[PDB]
């Protein structure tokens, strides 16, 4: 996160850190708890992820340094990547992780509501991007979970900012005209969370952008509302 500040413990209880175990304990991507055995994240995070066996999902974490040998985690039973996914810049940058065990909800770990298809018309004015990603282009993964408040940008305005790309309605952009606050490397897969009528909704999944926090280059996110049907298809399969 560029231009963010440290989160307080329990502030974003749906935020998870997805780790890889080889050769050592390392953060891979962010993710969001959406159900008691379901994490929503980005498809691009998974290149080179051959088997779900190398994954560990950690919830209720503020600092990466908390991650101890005896820290509880969730194993991943399955990785479900959208079948139309090719690359972040072309969309369909979404994936589900089915957990091996159930998350027991607490003040430190609980789900975020999906947007309502009937909420595709709502205007969110209180949106935050969170993560352990870089604070600048050439950096490293952060210890403390960072947060940044960013305004949503209309699809039409975002398309003006990325004239050489196709910004679809399955993408949502967020950023300040002058730049300064944005997601960056390591933040992908994590949430773009918006508060509406006292309820937090998972509006976006951190995906891509042209650099980080640049003037007139908003961050591009997977527009979760456009995937509610896909999510239900995968999570509610008979
Ligand atoms: C070798 C090639 C195949 C490259 C490859 O591997 N791609 C790849 C790998 C990573 C990556 C690497 C390591 C770790 C880890 N955990 O160490 C985690 C990640 C991670 O997923 O974030 C990231 C991306 C992009 C980068 C991008 C566009 C960007 C462009 C320019 C500079 C910085 C960032 C960006 C911008 C914004 C924003 N400004 N809103 C949001 C998301 C992203 N994500 C692609």
Swiss-Prot record:
Per the UniProt entry, the effect of residue 124 to H is:
In FA11D; transfected cells contain reduced amount of mutant protein and display decreased secretion
Q: What is this protein called?
A: Coagulation factor XIa light chain
Q: Source organism's superkingdom? A: Eukaryota
Disulphide-bridged cysteine pairs: 29-45, 127-194, 158-173, 184-212
Gene field = F11
- Domain annotation Peptidase S1: ranges: 1-236
Which residues are catalytic?
44, 93, 188
Q: Give the residues the record marks as binding heparin.
A: 160-163
Covered range of the whole protein: 388 to 625 of 625
Question: Where does the UniProt entry place glycosylation sites?
Answer: 63, 104
Organism whose genome encodes this protein: Homo sapiens
């Amino acid at each position: 996160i560029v231009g963010g500040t440290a989160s307080v413990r329990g502030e974003w209880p749906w935020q998870v850190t997805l780790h890889t175990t080889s050769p050592t304990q390392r953060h891979l991507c962010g993710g969001s708890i959406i159900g008691n055995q379901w994490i929503l994240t980005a498809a691009h995070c998974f290149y080179g992820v051959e088997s779900p066996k190398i994954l560990r999902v950690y919830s209720g974490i503020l600092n990466q340094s908390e991650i101890k040998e005896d820290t509880s985690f969730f194993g991943v039973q399955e990785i479900i990547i959208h079948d139309q996914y090719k690359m972040a810049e072309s969309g369909y940058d979404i994936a589900l992780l089915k957990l091996e065990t159930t998350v027991n909800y607490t003040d430190s770990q609980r789900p975020i509501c999906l947007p309502s298809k009937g909420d595709r018309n709502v205007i969110y004015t209180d949106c935050w991007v969170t993560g352990w990603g870089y604070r600048k282009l050439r950096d490293k993964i952060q210890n403390t979970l960072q947060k940044a408040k960013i305004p949503l940008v209309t699809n039409e305005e975002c398309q003006k900012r990325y004239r050489g790309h196709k910004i679809t309605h399955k993408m949502i952009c967020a950023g300040y005209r002058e730049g300064g606050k944005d997601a960056c490397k390591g933040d992908s897969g994590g949430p773009l969370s918006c508060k509406h009528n006292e309820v937090w909704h998972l509006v976006g999944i951190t995906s891509w952008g042209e650099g980080c926090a640049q003037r007139e280059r908003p961050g591009v996110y997977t527009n979760v509302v456009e995937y509610v049907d896909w999510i239900l298809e995968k999570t509610q399969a008979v």
